[PDB]
Structure 1
Amino acid sequence: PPAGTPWGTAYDKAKAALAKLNLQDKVGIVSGVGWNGGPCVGNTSPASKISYPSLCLQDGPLGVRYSTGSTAFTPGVQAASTWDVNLIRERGQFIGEEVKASGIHVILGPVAGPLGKTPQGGRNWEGFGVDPYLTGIAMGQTINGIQSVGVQATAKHYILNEQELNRETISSNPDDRTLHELYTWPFADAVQANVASVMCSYNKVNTTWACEDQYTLQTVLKDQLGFPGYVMTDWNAQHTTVQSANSGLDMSMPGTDFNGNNRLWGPALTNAVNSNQVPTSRVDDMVTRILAAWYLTGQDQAGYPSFNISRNVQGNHKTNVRAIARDGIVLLKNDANILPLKKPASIAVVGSAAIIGNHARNSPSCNDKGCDDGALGMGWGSGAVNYPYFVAPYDAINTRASSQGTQVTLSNTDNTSSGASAARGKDVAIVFITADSGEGYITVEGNAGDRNNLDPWHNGNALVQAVAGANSNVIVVVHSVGAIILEQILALPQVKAVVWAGLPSQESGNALVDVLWGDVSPSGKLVYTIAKSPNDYNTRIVSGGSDSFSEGLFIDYKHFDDANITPRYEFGYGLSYTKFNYSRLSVLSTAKSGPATGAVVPGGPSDLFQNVATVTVDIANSGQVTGAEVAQLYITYPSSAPRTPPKQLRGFAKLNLTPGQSGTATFNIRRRDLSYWDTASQKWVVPSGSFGISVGASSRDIRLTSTLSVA
C-alpha cells in the first residue's frame, strides 16, 4: 500500500506496534475467545502492551444486533432501491455512529455476497440487488459512510455464497471471467473505498473451503485487488489450523464451534508456529493487517466508548430509515389515476401484513425476526435486529384517513370472506401481501432460508382474488424479500395499482402513506427482474454438491435480454406520479484499448477506477407534479469483444424536479466500466471498437442512443 494514502499511514503505525508484542500477544489478537466467549458476537484477546483492547465485533449490515436502544435501518436492498447514493452514504454513516456509541469496533457488513443470482436466495435482501455495478457503488458509498465515523467495516461474504441450502458443504465453481467480472467486481469497490475487513464465506470454491482457499484469498483479493486489510472467517467457517493460516486467513471467528469444540487456532496455533508448520512472517502479517484497520479507523485515539448495548444511541436516525423506506418504494402499476389517493369517502385495508404482528413485536417466538407474522420490514437470520418501534401500515393509514374524514374498515387476517366483506362498498380497497426469507439455519413456514417458491405467502394470491371480486378499485401492496410472480394478481381487471414497498423496517407505515397520499411521488426503481413465470429465470437453488455457475455472466436481466424473454417488470423499472423527457444526449471519451497498466492499489491497478469517459443527458419534468427520476446508463460492448451481456448498467443519476423543471444527469465512466476480464492474458482489458450507449428510465425503456469509440 502506497504512502501518503490512508492505508499506507496505518501500516506504519501497525508495524511499529507489532514490535512490542510476543507470540502470546499475537495469537490472542487473531484468535476468537470462543462462541459467546465475550460480551459481543465476536471477541479476541487484548494486548495491553500496545493498549489494544479486546476487539468487539457485532452484527450487522442494517444496525446493532441484540441492542435495546438501537435503530433498525432498512435492509441494504431497500437502500439500493432508492438509487440514491446520498441516502446510501448517510445510511452507512448513521449505522457507524450507533456502532461507535455502543462501544463496538467492527460492524459485520455491508453485503456484496450474495450478489443475488437466484430470486429464491434467502439472503439477497441483505445485499444491494443483482447488478455488480450498482452493488459496487453502494458498497463504496456505505463503507465510506461507516468508516468515516471511526468504525471498522466488513465486506461480506467472500465469495459465491449465492444460496442458503447446504451453504456449508456446497461448492461454487464458476469460470475465471465470471469470478472476476461479476461476483468479485462489487468487492473491488469495497477494497477501493478502503474497507477494514473481509469475511470469507461458509461455502467451497472449486472444492476448497473459502476460508482455506489460497487462490481467492491470496492471489485475487489480497494480491490482485490489493487488499491491505484483514480476512475473518464466518462463524465456524474455518476447518484447519495450518492450511487456513498459510492460505491468507487473518482471524478465527468466533474461536470455537457452538459446543465449544473445533478450536483450530489459539493454543493450537501456538503449537503450529513452534513446529514451523506456520512461519512467523505469516502470523506477523495477520496482526499487521488487523492492527492497521484499528489504526485506519483511529480507534486507538482518545476515548472510544466502552461496550454498552443497552445505551440509547438512536438519536434522530429514523430520518434516514424514513427517507429510504419512502424513496425505495417502487410503483409497478397505476391505472386511471387511482393513486395518489385524494380524500375518498371510504377505505378497506385487508391482510395480516397490514397490522402489527410477532415480527414487528420482537416476539420471543419470532427470534432473529424468524417469522412472517403481521407487518414485514426485513428478512430473518444474523442480519436482523430488534425494532425500537414499528409503524404498521394500518395504523398510519388510519390516522391519516381519519384526519381528513375518510372512514376505514379493517380485515386484519388473510381470510377471503372477511377480506371481501370489508372491501365491498368502499371507494378503494388496499390489500397487503408478503414473501419472506432469511439465513438458512432457521426454517420459517417450511422455507429453510431460501424460498420454496416465488408466490405470495399465506395464500396472498387467493386474498387478492377474493377482494377483487368484491371491489372495482383494488390497490395491492407488497412487502417482499425478492421477486414475486404477479400474473394472477395482474389478471384481475379490478387490480388498478400495485405498490412494490420492499423492506421498509421500522418506518413501514409512514413511508407508505407518504407515497399513497402523494406527499412524495414514488421514485424507487427495481434492482432485480420480476418475471412472468418462474421458468423464465435461468438459475436454481442447487440441491447437489456443486453449482457450476455455467450461466456465467448472464444472470437476472442479462439473461432476459440475451434470450429475448419479456419480463413483467424489468430491472430498473419504476413509475412516478409525474413523467419525464430525455434530450440532448452527449458522449465524450479519451479511453484507450489494452490492459490496465497502473500498479496495484486498494481496488486493483490504479487506472481502473479513474474516469475515462463522460455521458450526459437532460431530464425534464414533463408532468404536472414534482418528482424524482432515476436516469440510467446501459452499455453494449463492441463486436470485437468476446460474448458479453448485451446491456450492462454502467451509470445512474437521480434528479428531483418541479413541473417543467429541467436538469442534467452526468455519468462518469471509469476504465473498468469499459473493461472485461480477459482470461488468457489474466488482465482487465478495454476492447477496441464501437460501444453502444443506451440512456433511459430502465434496462428496457431506452429513450436515447449513441456510440463511444476506442482506438
Structure 2
Amino acid sequence: VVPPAGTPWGTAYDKAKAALAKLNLQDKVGIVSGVGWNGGPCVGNTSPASKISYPSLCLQDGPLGVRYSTGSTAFTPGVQAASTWDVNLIRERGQFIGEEVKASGIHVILGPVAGPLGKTPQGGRNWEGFGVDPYLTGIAMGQTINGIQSVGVQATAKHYILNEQELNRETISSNPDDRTLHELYTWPFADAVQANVASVMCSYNKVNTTWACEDQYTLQTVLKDQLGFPGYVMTDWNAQHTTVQSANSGLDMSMPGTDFNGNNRLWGPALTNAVNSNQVPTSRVDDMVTRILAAWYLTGQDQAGYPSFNISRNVQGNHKTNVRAIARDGIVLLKNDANILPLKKPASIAVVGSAAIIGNHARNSPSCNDKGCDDGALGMGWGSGAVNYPYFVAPYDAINTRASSQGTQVTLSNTDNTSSGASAARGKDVAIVFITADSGEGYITVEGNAGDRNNLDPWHNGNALVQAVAGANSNVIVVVHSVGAIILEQILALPQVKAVVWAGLPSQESGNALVDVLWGDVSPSGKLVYTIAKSPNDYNTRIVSGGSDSFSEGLFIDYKHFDDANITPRYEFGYGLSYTKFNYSRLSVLSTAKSGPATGAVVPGGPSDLFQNVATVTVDIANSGQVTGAEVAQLYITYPSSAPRTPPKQLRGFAKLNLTPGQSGTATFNIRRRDLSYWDTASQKWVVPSGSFGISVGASSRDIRLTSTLSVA
C-alpha cells in the first residue's frame, strides 16, 4: 500500500503529501490530465501548479533517446544493449540517455520497454525491448532505469501489459492464465518497480476483454498492491476509454489528453465533472496526484535549476562511446567457417547490397518519418521509438576507409540487384553482402509490412542477392542488420557462405562497430536474445488476426518452447561465436534458500524478500584459444520436477568477462529468492518449491559446460 519510511520513495511521499495539501481540485485535475494531442511542446504535457512550483510536466519519447531533437544521440535500440549481455553498458546507456533528456529539459522519458516482451519473432516492436527472456529483460530494465533516474529524470516502464503484437493492438484482447500473466510477462515490470521506476505506461490492448488502461486487476491489484508500485500510471497515447472506470481502476494520468483529432477528452473538465458528480471519489484523484508528485520529488525535479525545454540543444557530448560500444559488443557472430573472420590484408573486397550505403533511413529523409523506411543502411525499427540520427556511419564508408588504409581494393555494388552484385563479387578475395529486415509500430505500413513483419525472410530480395553473390564468389561474408530473427537456411545452404554476422541494430555507429569486429580489433562477444529457428513453423506463436489471443502457449515462449518440444533451432537463445575459445571449470553453489511463499512485507517489487539474495553460483572461465575475447557465461535453472509445470530451463544469471589468451576470471551469479520461485495463482504469491534444482552453466541455452544442483529442504 505505502512505501516504507527512510527509503527514497518514502521521503518522496512525505514531500508529495505536503504539496497535495496546498492544492485544490483544479490544480489536481491539471496535474493528471494531458493538455491534448500536440497541445504542448512535448510529446506529453500537463498543466502547471504554481502553488507548489510544479511545472507543466514535459513527457518525451523514447526508449533509445530524445525524439524530435536535432542535437541528440541516437542510442542503439534496447535489443542491441541486451545482446551485449553487459550490465555496465546497459546501465551506461540509461545514464547517457538520462543526461540527454535532462539537458533537453524533458522531465519524463517514455521508456524503457518490457512489453512487448517479444513472444513472436514477427512482432513489430520487439526490437525496442530487451529480448524474449523475462530474467534478462528484467535485469536490463532495472539497470536502464537505475541509469536514467540517477540523472534525475523520470523513466516510464512500458507497455503494461501483453501488447505482444502490433496488428489490432487497440482492440485485441490478450487472455493468458494467471500464472502466465504474472510469471512471464509481469516479471520484468517487477524489476522496473524494484528499480524505483517513476512511471508505468498502460497499453492499447485488452487483457481478458478489459482495456489495459481500465483494468482494476492489473493496475490496482497487481501493479500497485502486489508489486508495491508507488509511482503513477499513464495511458499509452489515447489508450483511455472511459472517464470514470479508468480513474477508479487506478489510472493516474491521461495522455496526451485527446485523440489525434482533438476528440475523446475523458479527463480535464470531464474528470472535474465526474468528481463533482460523485462518480470518482476525491481520494482517488488525491492518490493520482500523490503518485505523480512523489515521482517528481523522487527524481529531485523540484529543486531549482532544471533545464528549460529545448530540443535544438546539442546534448550529445561524447555519448557516442556507448553507441559505438553496444553496436560493437552486440554483434553476434553466427558462422565463421575456415576462420575467414577476422579479415587480414585481402587484396580485394566486394561490398554488395543497398544496406551498405547511406540511404533515406540514415538521412532522416522526409520519405522516412518516424524511421518508416528500410532504405540504405539500417539502424533501428520504425514508430514512436525511433529518433533522428545526428550522423550515421555506413558500413561501406567505414569498410572502404579501413581497407584502403592497407592497400585493399574495394568494389561496391550499392543496390540489391543480383546481377550487379555477382559482377562486383567476381574475382575478389572476399565478398561482404548486406541484408536487412525491418519492422515497427503499427501505424506505418512499410513495403507492405503493417508493423509486425509479414514473414521471416530478408527484405529487398535478400536471399537472392546472397545466392547470386555465392554464384560468383567462393568466400562470402553475410552481414545482417535486423529487427529480429530471420530464417537463414537458404543462405546457409550455400557452401560459399563462410561467415554470417548478425550485426543487429547499431544506430549511428553501424560502420565503425562492424569494422571493429570484421578486422578483429575486438573479438565479437554478443550472443542472441531470441531463437533463430530452422523453420518459421518451429515457432509456437503467430501474429493473431482475430479479436483474441488466448496465449495458450503459456510459459513456453521462444527457447522454452524449443526445449520443451525438443526442436533443434539453427541458432539457440544465448548463442554467439568468438574469435577465441573459453574453458569452464570449478562450479560451486552456495545457498541458504528456504522453501515456501515469500514472507516479506510488500515493498516496491513485491514482498521485500523476493529481490534479496538467497544463493550464489560461481564458475571459473579461462581463455584457452589464441586471441583476447569476452565470454558471456549463462546460468540456467531447472526447477524441481515436483513443482508446477515449468519450462525445462530458465535463464537465472549471466556474467561477461574479457579474457586475454591464458587469462582466467570468475563468473558470479547471485540468486534472488524470486529466481527460485514460481507464481502460485490460488494464493497470489511467489513460492519457492522444495527439492533439488538443476544448475546449468554454459556458453548458451544449449551449450551447457557444467552442471550442479541447488537443494531446498
Q: What does the per-residue CA deviation read over 1:250-294, in whole Å, with 9 as the maximum and x for residues that have no partner?
A: 000000011111000000011110011000000000000000000
Counterpart secondary structure, 1:358: coil
Cα distance in 2 between the residues matched to 1:215 and 1:11: 24
* 2:456 counterpart residue number: 454
Task: Give the C-alpha shift of residue 565 in structure 1.
Answer: 0.2
Q: How does 1:507-522 map to 2 (within 5 A)?
A: 507-522=509-524
Task: Give the C-alpha shift of residue 681 in structure 1.
Answer: 2.0
Task: Give the C-alpha shift of residue 455 in structure 1.
Answer: 0.2
Q: What does the per-residue CA deviation read over 1:469-511, in whole Å, with 9 as the maximum and x for residues that have no partner?
A: 1000000000000000000000000000000000000000000
Cα distance in 1 between the residues matched to 2:567 and 2:360: 40
Q: What does the per-residue CA deviation read over 1:289-334, in whole Å, with 9 as the maximum and x for residues that have no partner?
A: 0000000000000200000110000000000000000000000000
* 1:367 counterpart residue number: 369
Corresponding residue pairs, total: 711
Q: What does the per-residue CA deviation read over 1:452-474, in whole Å, with 9 as the maximum and x for residues that have no partner?
A: 00000001000000000100000
Cα distance in 1 between the residues matched to 2:418 and 2:270: 61
Cα distance in 1 between the residues matched to 2:639 and 2:236: 37
* 2:690 counterpart residue number: 688
Cα distance in 2 between the residues matched to 1:257 and 1:336: 57
Counterpart secondary structure, 1:53: coil
Task: Give the C-alpha shift of residue 26 in structure 1.
Answer: 0.4
Cα distance in 2 between the residues matched to 1:616 and 1:249: 43
* 2:211 counterpart residue number: 209
Counterpart secondary structure, 1:360: coil
Query: Which residue of 536, 539, 551 corresponds with 2:553?
Result: 551
Counterpart secondary structure, 2:189: helix
Task: Give the C-alpha shift of residue 232 in structure 1.
Answer: 0.2
Q: What does the per-residue CA deviation read over 1:594-641, in whole Å, with 9 as the maximum and x for residues that have no partner?
A: 000000000000000000111111000001110000000000010110
Task: Give the C-alpha shift of residue 679 in structure 1.
Answer: 1.4
* 1:484 counterpart residue number: 486
Cα distance in 2 between the residues matched to 1:687 and 1:458: 50
Structure 2: stretches of 5+ with no match in the other structure: none
Cα distance in 2 between the residues matched to 1:455 and 1:626: 34
Cα distance in 1 between the residues matched to 2:496 and 2:19: 69
Task: Give the C-alpha shift of residue 114 in structure 1.
Answer: 0.2
Cα distance in 1 between the residues matched to 2:501 and 2:449: 25
Counterpart secondary structure, 1:666: strand
Counterpart secondary structure, 1:293: helix
Cα distance in 2 between the residues matched to 1:104 and 1:522: 36
Counterpart secondary structure, 1:464: helix
Task: Give the C-alpha shift of residue 111 in structure 1.
Answer: 0.2
Counterpart secondary structure, 1:418: helix
Task: Give the C-alpha shift of residue 642 in structure 1.
Answer: 1.2
Identity of aligned residues (%): 100
* 2:499 counterpart residue number: 497
Cα distance in 1 between the residues matched to 2:666 and 2:157: 33
Cα distance in 2 between the residues matched to 1:138 and 1:117: 17
Counterpart secondary structure, 1:332: strand
Cα distance in 2 between the residues matched to 1:227 and 1:682: 17
Cα distance in 1 between the residues matched to 2:261 and 2:591: 59
Cα distance in 1 between the residues matched to 2:562 and 2:259: 42
* Structure-2-length-normalised TM-score: 1.00
Counterpart secondary structure, 1:477: strand
Q: How does 1:466-615 map to 2 (within 5 A)?
A: 466-615=468-617
Cα distance in 1 between the residues matched to 2:24 and 2:312: 35
Counterpart secondary structure, 2:590: strand
Q: How does 1:264-413 map to 2 (within 5 A)?
A: 264-413=266-415
Task: Give the C-alpha shift of residue 165 in structure 1.
Answer: 0.2
* 1:445 counterpart residue number: 447
Cα distance in 1 between the residues matched to 2:644 and 2:228: 27
Cα distance in 1 between the residues matched to 2:642 and 2:152: 46
Q: What does the per-residue CA deviation read over 1:627-663, in whole Å, with 9 as the maximum and x for residues that have no partner?
A: 0000000000101101100000000000000100101
Counterpart secondary structure, 1:359: coil
* 1:656 counterpart residue number: 658
Task: Give the C-alpha shift of residue 339 in structure 1.
Answer: 0.5
Counterpart secondary structure, 1:654: strand
Task: Give the C-alpha shift of residue 337 in structure 1.
Answer: 1.2
Cα distance in 2 between the residues matched to 1:164 and 1:246: 28
Cα distance in 2 between the residues matched to 1:259 and 1:444: 23
Q: What does the per-residue CA deviation read over 1:44-96, in whole Å, with 9 as the maximum and x for residues that have no partner?
A: 00000101001100000000000010100000000000000000000000000
* 2:201 counterpart residue number: 199
Task: Give the C-alpha shift of residue 680 in structure 1.
Answer: 2.0
Q: What does the per-residue CA deviation read over 1:504-562, in whole Å, with 9 as the maximum and x for residues that have no partner?
A: 00000000000000000000000000000000000011000000011000000000000
Cα distance in 2 between the residues matched to 1:418 and 1:451: 28
Cα distance in 1 between the residues matched to 2:330 and 2:270: 48
Counterpart secondary structure, 2:618: strand
Task: Give the C-alpha shift of residue 128 in structure 1.
Answer: 0.2
* 1:239 counterpart residue number: 241
* 1:97 counterpart residue number: 99
Cα distance in 1 between the residues matched to 2:590 and 2:629: 29
The answer as to 2:73 corresponding to 1:75 is no
Counterpart secondary structure, 2:711: strand
Cα distance in 1 between the residues matched to 2:181 and 2:92: 30
Cα distance in 2 between the residues matched to 1:667 and 1:282: 42
Counterpart secondary structure, 1:581: strand
Cα distance in 1 between the residues matched to 2:242 and 2:462: 47
Cα distance in 2 between the residues matched to 1:259 and 1:556: 39
Cα distance in 2 between the residues matched to 1:334 and 1:633: 25
Q: What does the per-residue CA deviation read over 1:160-215, in whole Å, with 9 as the maximum and x for residues that have no partner?
A: 00000000000000000001100000000000000000000000000000000000
Q: What does the per-residue CA deviation read over 1:386-419, in whole Å, with 9 as the maximum and x for residues that have no partner?
A: 0000000000000000011000000000001100
Counterpart secondary structure, 1:218: helix
Counterpart secondary structure, 2:651: strand
Cα distance in 1 between the residues matched to 2:291 and 2:27: 15
Query: Which residue of 49, 52, 56 corresponds with 2:51?
Result: 49
Q: What does the per-residue CA deviation read over 1:209-246, in whole Å, with 9 as the maximum and x for residues that have no partner?
A: 00000000000000000000000001100010111000
Counterpart secondary structure, 1:640: coil
Cα distance in 2 between the residues matched to 1:438 and 1:213: 26
Query: Which residue of 161, 168, 171 corresponds with 1:169?
Result: 171
Task: Give the C-alpha shift of residue 9 in structure 1.
Answer: 0.4
Cα distance in 2 between the residues matched to 1:29 and 1:176: 34
Counterpart secondary structure, 2:472: coil
Counterpart secondary structure, 1:677: strand
Cα distance in 2 between the residues matched to 1:145 and 1:548: 36
* Structure-1-length-normalised TM-score: 1.00
Cα distance in 2 between the residues matched to 1:32 and 1:369: 26
Cα distance in 2 between the residues matched to 1:24 and 1:284: 12
Counterpart secondary structure, 1:656: strand
Q: What does the per-residue CA deviation read over 1:341-367, in whole Å, with 9 as the maximum and x for residues that have no partner?
A: 001000000000000000000000110
* 2:128 counterpart residue number: 126
Counterpart secondary structure, 1:184: helix
Cα distance in 2 between the residues matched to 1:654 and 1:441: 38
Cα distance in 2 between the residues matched to 1:653 and 1:536: 29
Task: Give the C-alpha shift of residue 588 in structure 1.
Answer: 1.1
Q: What does the per-residue CA deviation read over 1:137-177, in whole Å, with 9 as the maximum and x for residues that have no partner?
A: 00000000000000000000000000000000000000000
Cα distance in 1 between the residues matched to 2:631 and 2:166: 35
Cα distance in 2 between the residues matched to 1:4 and 1:343: 61
RMSD of Structure 2 on Structure 1 (CA): 0.4
Counterpart secondary structure, 2:22: coil
Cα distance in 2 between the residues matched to 1:7 and 1:679: 29
* 1:220 counterpart residue number: 222
Counterpart secondary structure, 2:338: coil
Counterpart secondary structure, 1:430: strand
